[PDB]
Amino acid sequence: ANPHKDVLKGPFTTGSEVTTQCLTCHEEQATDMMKTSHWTWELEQKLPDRTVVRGKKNSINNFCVAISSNEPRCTSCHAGYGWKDNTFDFKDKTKVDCLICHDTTGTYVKDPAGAGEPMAKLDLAKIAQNVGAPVRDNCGSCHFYGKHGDLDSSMAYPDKATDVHMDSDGNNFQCQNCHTTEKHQISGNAMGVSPGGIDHIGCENCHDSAPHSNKKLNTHTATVACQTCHIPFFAKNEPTKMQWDWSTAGDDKPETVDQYGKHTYQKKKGNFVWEKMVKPQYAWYNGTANAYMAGDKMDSNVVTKLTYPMGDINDAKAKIYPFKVHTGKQIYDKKLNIFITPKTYGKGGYWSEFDWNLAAKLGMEANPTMLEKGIKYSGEYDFAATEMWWRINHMVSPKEQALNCNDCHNKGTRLDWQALGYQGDPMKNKQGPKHK
Ligand code: HEC
Ligand code: HEC
Ligand code: HEC
Ligand code: HEC
Ligand code: HEC
Ligand code: HEC
Ligand code: HEC
Ligand code: HEC
């Protein structure tokens, strides 16, 4: 037994007061955790032409776009308390959130607009006393809401049909059963992070790399990622957003709904398309990814890929992997040719004032990178098309629903042979295209 139940009677009125207790004995864990991306929101990433500091802190996406000037809404999913703008003290140990991963009561909740602060009226003392090993639902406080359509609210206690590894009646894995954690470094590669292992966890430390009695299926694994055949669908239980058109935001037309009660229009955000039971898109992937970074020039007559997997048929490091792809339109500076990071949340933000010029001006004056590069909002904006790629790794289906020969070959359409660089279906056509 540990001392928790005896030492943490409180009263506690704030998160850091809780944390300041945890540190009388777990200063090491804070120090360790603070070295990681869960605390800094930064990752180094090797792009085709340059190494950058990406991570969430520096990323641009086609959903909410970017954290700067919006921090109080976004850092409800930071393992910290108080990150509300650019003055956040990343060296302050009393600001780590120790409860979000370790709460066992199921009541600990971070206020969705509170810059990481817990909701009002929690029994903090009680939460602190009951702290223990994370389960799926702790990771899921940030990982099941917003997007990746492969981790849903039902991954809290999913069935076999949803995920064979996490299946609470079967293998019942917690996330760290695969994402092994040492010194609060939670293992697992985000897309475009390496080194010479595309997947740090992948499928091959618990399965043989030739796991099939059918040898022809084993020969495919040099080219086709396990994830491709074994995750035939994501968003199995609940719709995910497939498109977000910001260009239409700001009108008082009716805020219409889906088959599934999801909004297809909202004044504050624009138009959406939702989909349930989604086939992935397939692409060559060798462990590296391209990314759009703040300040990059772009071209509005074309779709901009905000991220994209690298590799191709001639790339011996690349395999065909499955991806979720989200498309949209979003705001760009019509004079510089760059995407803008606008203020949507809070005072002057789009969501209260519905004025894109003001949201642009305020979001650009708050962005550290724009400032670093002397970039000023020009005063003119427009909307441009984008696509963004995320890896699909969860919801492995039972073996009976793996893609089989006829999903890809013969009348199968899973793979777009020519987009992948093949000369027709390789089974009809043993002449032109082979991986390596
Ligand atoms: C000393 C008075 C402690 C305070 C205050 C807190 N914790 Fe603790 N914790 C303490 C000990 C001696 C142990 C056992 C360490 C060992 O391995 O010998 C623990 C254990 C934990 C764990 C592991 C829980 C598990 O089920 O394995 C966690 C996750 C943990 N402690 C977290 C934690 C937090 C968040 C605290 C503030 C709320 C906290 N502890 C206070 C000693 C002490
Ligand atoms: C909210 C407070 C989170 C909780 C709770 C957990 N994670 Fe998380 N995770 C969060 C963010 C904002 C990010 C991106 C960090 C960045 O800037 O890069 C992540 C990332 C991951 C990753 C990807 C690797 C990485 O990006 O560095 C993994 C593999 C991951 N998270 C796993 C993970 C697990 C297993 C969790 C429970 C123990 C967990 N996370 C909690 C936000 C939050
Ligand atoms: C998720 C993003 C986490 C945050 C924030 C914190 N911890 Fe953690 N902790 C996390 C994991 C995935 C693990 C391993 C769990 C397992 O099942 O093996 C732990 C482990 C601990 C432990 C025991 C092991 C150790 O390193 O000593 C302790 C004592 C612990 N965690 C405490 C702790 C504290 C005090 C935190 C806030 C400052 C904290 N953890 C944050 C995941 C995450
Ligand atoms: C094995 C059976 C897994 C379980 C259980 C969970 N995850 Fe996972 N995850 C797994 C793999 C093979 C990968 C690819 C990365 C690798 O190094 O092999 C991932 C990846 C992630 C990521 C990164 C996704 C991305 O940004 O590209 C995250 C954020 C993530 N996983 C989170 C996560 C959570 C929250 C889980 C519990 C609900 C979880 N994973 C379980 C394998 C496995
Ligand atoms: C499609 C081209 C596949 C690739 C690539 C991989 N697998 Fe597969 N797998 C596929 C089928 C059609 C089936 C069902 C047929 C069967 O052998 O049952 C499977 C099955 C498995 C299983 C279950 C094996 C059994 O007990 O019968 C496992 C454990 C498994 N596959 C794992 C797996 C891994 C780890 C892969 C990458 C190394 C992999 N498969 C590739 C189709 C395809
Ligand atoms: C260990 C940490 C694992 C990792 C990482 C992955 N898999 Fe797994 N898998 C694991 C176990 C213990 C089991 C059950 C095996 C049994 O004896 O019943 C499985 C099961 C599968 C299956 C079979 C599902 C079924 O129909 O019963 C498949 C097809 C499978 N696993 C594939 C798979 C893939 C593609 C993974 C990477 C994303 C993966 N596994 C990771 C252990 C672990
Ligand atoms: C998609 C995810 C597939 C499934 C399911 C199956 N196959 Fe496949 N096939 C796929 C690719 C991407 C390739 C090219 C591999 C390469 O070397 O570049 C192939 C290739 C073949 C071939 C021609 C090569 C050969 O092995 O002689 C054959 C005859 C073939 N595939 C047959 C086959 C069968 C019988 C399958 C079911 C067990 C099967 N494939 C599944 C993609 C996919
Ligand atoms: C929890 C419910 C979240 C809230 C609220 C917000 N975000 Fe998030 N985001 C969350 C996680 C767990 C991750 C890591 C995903 C992984 O699989 O590795 C992220 C990541 C981002 C990124 C990086 C690129 C991407 O995956 O889209 C960006 C640019 C981003 N998030 C932006 C963002 C903004 C602007 C938010 C508030 C307005 C916001 N997020 C809230 C989880 C959660």
> Helices marked H in 365-424 — which ranges?
368-372, 405-408
- The 3-state DSSP class for residue 369 equals helix
Closest ligand 8 atom to Cα of 63: 27
Neighbours of 117 (CB within 10 A): 20
Q: Which two tokens stand for residue 156?
A: 């809290």
Going by C-alpha positions, the residue among 277, 285, 272 that lies closest to residue 323 is: 285
Distances (CA, A) of 293 to 173, 247, 286, 298, 355: 36, 21, 21, 10, 24
- The 3-state DSSP class for residue 346 equals coil
Distances (CA, A) of 341 to 64, 166, 269: 9, 37, 15
Closest ligand 6 atom to Cα of 399: 26
**Ligand 2: which residues within 6 Å by Cβ?**
37-38, 41-43, 55-57, 77-79, 100-101, 134, 138-139, 141-143, 175-176, 179, 186, 188, 190
Q: Which two tokens stand for residue 384?
A: 């441009």
Q: Which two tokens stand for residue 383?
A: 């909307």
Taking the centre of ligand 1 as the mean of its atom positions, its distance from the CA of residue 132, in whole angstroms, is 8
Residue labelled with tokens 């709460």: 103
Q: Which two tokens stand for residue 286?
A: 């060798």
Question: Has 165 been labeled as part of a binding site?
Answer: yes
Solving technique: X-ray
- The contacts of residue 22 (CB under 8 Å, 6+ apart) are 29, 30, 98, 128
Taking the centre of ligand 3 as the mean of its atom positions, its distance from the CA of residue 3, in whole angstroms, is 16
Q: Is 160 in the pocket of ligand 7 (CB under 6 A)?
A: no
Distances (CA, A) of 397 to 149, 278, 342, 394: 14, 13, 39, 9
Q: Which two tokens stand for residue 339?
A: 């995407």
Task: Tell me the C-alpha distance between 130 and 142, whole Å.
Answer: 20
DSSP string across 252-317: -S---B-TTS-BSEETTTEEEEEESSBPPEEEEE-S-EEE--TT----TTS-EESEEE---TT-TT
Q: Are 287 and 194 in contact (CB under 8 A)?
A: yes
Distances (CA, A) of 148 to 183, 238, 392: 27, 12, 8
Q: What is the CA radius of gyration of the chain?
A: 23
Residue labelled with tokens 């509300």: 84
Q: Which amino acid is at 370?
A: M
Distances (CA, A) of 354 to 83, 120, 195, 246, 359: 25, 30, 44, 12, 8
Q: Are 178 and 207 in contact (CB under 8 A)?
A: no
Which ligand sits closest to the CA of 207? 5
- Strands 281-285 vs 289-291: parallel, antiparallel or unpaired: unpaired
Q: Are 13 and 19 in contact (CB under 8 A)?
A: no
Going by C-alpha positions, the residue among 58, 59, 387 that lies closest to residue 245 is: 387
**DSSP designation for 153:** G
- The 3-state DSSP class for residue 236 equals coil
Taking the centre of ligand 7 as the mean of its atom positions, its distance from the CA of residue 325, in whole angstroms, is 24
**What is the experimental resolution, given in Å to one decimal place?**
2.2
Q: Which protein residue's CA is at the shortest distance from atom 27 of ligand 2?
A: 37
- The 3-state DSSP class for residue 234 equals strand
Going by C-alpha positions, the residue among 77, 72, 95 that lies closest to residue 16 is: 95
Task: Tell me the C-alpha distance between 173 and 350, whole Å.
Answer: 42
Taking the centre of ligand 6 as the mean of its atom positions, its distance from the CA of residue 276, in whole angstroms, is 24
Task: Tell me the C-alpha distance between 227 and 233, whole Å.
Answer: 11
Q: Left (φ > 0), alpha (ψ -120 to 50) or beta: where does 83 sit?
A: beta
Q: Which residues are registered as beta bridge partners of 38?
A: none
HEC letters along 154-212: HHHCCCCCCCCCCCCCCCCCCHHHHCCEECCEECCCCCCCCCCCCCCCCCCCCCCCCCC
Q: Where are the domains of the chain?
A: 1-232, 233-436
Q: Is 219 in the pocket of ligand 7 (CB under 6 A)?
A: yes
